[PDB]
């Protein structure tokens, strides 16, 4: 009766047999080749560590996790020590205590002495480990060693005076990141970590580097000295910039968000964060609109009251448009707002509502057709990848890191179709043509053979193809590949479709697909929640444009009425991510100015416009949600789609023989939040 640390679901790959070891007395059961450190963990005792991370390789480098294993000589490094059946582990014996005391003595001997300026002071492992396990007095007077600090782009500044030679950053940058730039060079006490040609680090996950590095040397530049940790509160939310819906924790003080950091979730993003998201808050603070505005006929903007704004918009809506009413659902919006907007429009009678990046074409709706079937976790079990029209390094960076994790674990041949790009794992480039996709759905391109000679293949279609005119042909060619290669078996459904927004899944789920094509052209009253509608341009000269949005930067100069809303860190909505898993964010900081939530503003607009919505509380909104699509109220559990892709094609001729266009560019100026934000702007200016 002893629960593991934090709770830790052991695997038991072969549950018929498993060794047992004595940890500090009482026994514990352990799988075949588990390390002494994880055995002690299962037994429920934490061992001090510096150079061991559960996601990177092992290296007996810090020499602090020492324990004594009776039936052995004096010292033993806990990590990298494979457990043996019956070894007599011991952690709190004078031998181990003195070992830890001495090692901490050496570290703090040749450490710098600048805690009260070195942030991570209050979070530092080395600090807490010394205070809890090390001695209380130092005996040292002579001069220490100091090195010069280093620059690694405007994300990770380093005062290398305190690089205690752990090689955590090196092992991360060479295993998970993919780009080999950081490296440990020198000798003896004179040993630094730094790129030898003063280059920068043009990769994501560098924020993950600053989280990995325990002692406060590699630290985020835009969070230079703004706060210690004990000062600010953390709210556990999800992400909306990427499409994976990463699980993060917003650390905020007062009405200001200071930083965001990953939080463990062993199903979506292990413990990492893509570089885009960690620095996406500064502009969320920086640029903002916080008053309902009306365009005065001199082309200017005046701040009006909610009564007047809603009255004028409802009046003109009822006034003119008989059948030409269209509504664009935002790129970063929640199912609540989407269902409220669709209900308001359908009660208005005229319905052309559609999501952000969902194609104007047919875009049939089968959950197995438009969600990533194999969960990201299961993605670690593939053998042959078939990325088509996708650069997952730039979109869904966490899925890219997962694919890299698979290729690192066991070499898995990966074939990629589309434009030239710089993959970081030994990729095969198969061409740029859906014509090649046809040939491989047929017999040429011997890579198809690999599929047939494959166990657990994976075929990943990027959501950028939804906007292409001929999508049913692509999906039908993929269907034929699947049928002929046996990749849809009931044991394993490896036919995945990525996404490149946070609202795309819930939009396609509720059914926001445009009933026609020239909707924006023929319209006269457009209701926007998100920008870009093609170069914000297809809207005609005379058209009532109402931008019910937040953080206005683009298309606002086209808007006719402006309604401020609450960002993704100030409200409670439901976002669905590509594997079909529906999470919910939580409020962290007060709304800015006098903006209101999206479903609230929609319901108020409906009432003042006459036809009202039968619901006026989040509970009834989610009840309507249960009526239209249930998992969205079955939040926080992925509900698979146990129906095949038996769609009906409508092109039946060819795949239009046009190359695959690039779906997302610059990786930072997308996502209006970051775009009107800033650190992403200078990262775009430099780290490219």
């Amino acid at each position: 009766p002893r629960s593991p640390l934090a709770g830790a679901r052991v695997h038991f790959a072969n549950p018929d047999d498993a060794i047992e070891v004595f940890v500090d007395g009482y026994p514990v059961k352990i799988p075949k080749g588990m390390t002494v450190l994880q055995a002690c963990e299962v037994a429920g005792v934490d061992i001090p560590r510096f150079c061991y991370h559960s996601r990177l390789s092992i290296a007996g480098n810090c020499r602090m996790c020492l324990v004594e294993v009776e039936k052995s000589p004096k010292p033993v490094a806990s990590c990298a020590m494979p457990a043996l059946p019956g070894m007599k582990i011991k952690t709190d014996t004078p031998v181990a205590k003195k070992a830890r005391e001495g090692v901490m003595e050496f570290l703090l001997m040749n450490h710098p002495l600048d805690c009260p300026i070195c942030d991570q002071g209050g979070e530092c492992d080395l600090q807490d480990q010394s205070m809890a396990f090390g001695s209380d007095r130092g005996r040292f007077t002579e001069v220490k060693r100091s090195v010069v600090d280093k620059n690694l782009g405007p994300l990770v500044k380093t005062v290398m005076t305190r690089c205690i030679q752990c090689t955590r950053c090196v092992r991360f940058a060479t295993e998970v990141a993919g780009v080999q730039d950081l490296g440990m060079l020198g000798r003896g006490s004179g040993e630094e970590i730094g790129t030898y040609v003063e280059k920068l680090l043009t990769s994501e996950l560098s924020g993950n580097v600053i989280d990995i590095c325990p002692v406060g040397a590699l630290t985020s530049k835009p969070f230079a000295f703004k706060a210690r940790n004990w000062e600010l509160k953390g709210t556990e939310t999800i992400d909306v910039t990427d499409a994976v819906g990463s699980n993060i924790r917003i650390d905020s003080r007062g009405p200001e968000v200071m930083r965001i950091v990953p939080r463990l979730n062993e199903d979506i993003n292990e413990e990492w964060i893509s570089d885009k998201t960690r620095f996406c808050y500064d502009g969320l603070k920086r640029q903002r609109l916080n008053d309902p505005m009306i365009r005065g006929p001199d082309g200017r903007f005046k701040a009006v009251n909610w009564r007047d704004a809603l009255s004028v918009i409802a009046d003109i809506a009822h006034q003119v448009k008989p059948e030409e009413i269209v509504g664009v659902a935002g790129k970063l919006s929640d199912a609540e707002s989407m269902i409220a907007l669709k209900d308001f429009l359908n009660r208005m009678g005229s319905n052309d509502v559609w999501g952000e990046g969902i194609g104007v074409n047919t875009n049939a709706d089968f959950r197995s057709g438009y969600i990533m079937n194999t969960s990201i976790a299961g993605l670690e079990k593939a053998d042959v990848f078939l990325l088509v029209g996708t650069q997952p390094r730039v979109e869904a960076a966490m899925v890219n890191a997962r694919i890299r994790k698979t290729v690192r674990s066991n070499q898995a041949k990966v074939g990629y179709i589309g434009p030239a790009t710089d993959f970081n794992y030994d990729h095969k480039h198969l061409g740029t043509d859906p014509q090649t996709l046809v040939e491989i759905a047929e017999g040429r391109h011997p890579f198809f053979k690999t599929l047939s000679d494959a166990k657990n293949p994976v075929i990943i279609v990027g959501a950028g193809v939804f906007e292409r005119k001929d999508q049913d042909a692509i999906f039908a060619a993929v269907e034929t590949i699947a049928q002929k290669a046996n990749v849809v078996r009931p044991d394993w459904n490896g036919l995945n479709v990525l996404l490149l927004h946070a609202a795309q899944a819930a939009a396609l789920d509720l059914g926001l697909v445009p009933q026609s094509e020239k909707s924006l052209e023929s319209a006269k009253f457009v209701y926007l929640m998100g920008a870009d509608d093609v170069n914000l341009d297809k809207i005609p000269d005379d058209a009532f444009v109402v931008y019910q949005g937040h953080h206005g930067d683009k298309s606002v100069y086209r808007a006719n009425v402006i309604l401020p809303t609450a960002a993704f860190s100030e409200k409670e909505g439901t976002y669905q991510n590509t594997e079909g898993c529906t999470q919910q964010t939580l409020p962290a900081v007060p709304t800015v100015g006098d903006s209101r939530d999206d479903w609230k503003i929609i319901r108020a607009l409906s009432e003042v416009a006459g036809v009202r919505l039968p619901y006026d509380t989040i509970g009834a909104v989610r009840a309507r949600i249960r009526n239209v699509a249930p998992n969205l109220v079955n939040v926080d559990e992925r509900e698979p789609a146990t129906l095949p892709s038996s769609l009906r094609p409508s092109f039946t001729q060819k795949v239009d023989t046009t190359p695959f266009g690039t779906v997302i560019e610059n990786f930072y100026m997308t996502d209006a939040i970051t775009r009107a934000s800033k650190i992403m702007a200078q990262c775009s200016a430099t780290l490219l």
């Binding site: 909610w306 709304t591 319901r603 108020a604 003042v608 009202r612 006026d616």
Partner: peptide
């Protein structure tokens, strides 16, 4: 009569 939801909505957004 303005369906008191709206009456609150015109005031602050914390109800």
């Amino acid at each position: 009569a303005i369906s008191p939801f709206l009456k609150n909505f015109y005031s602050s957004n914390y109800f």
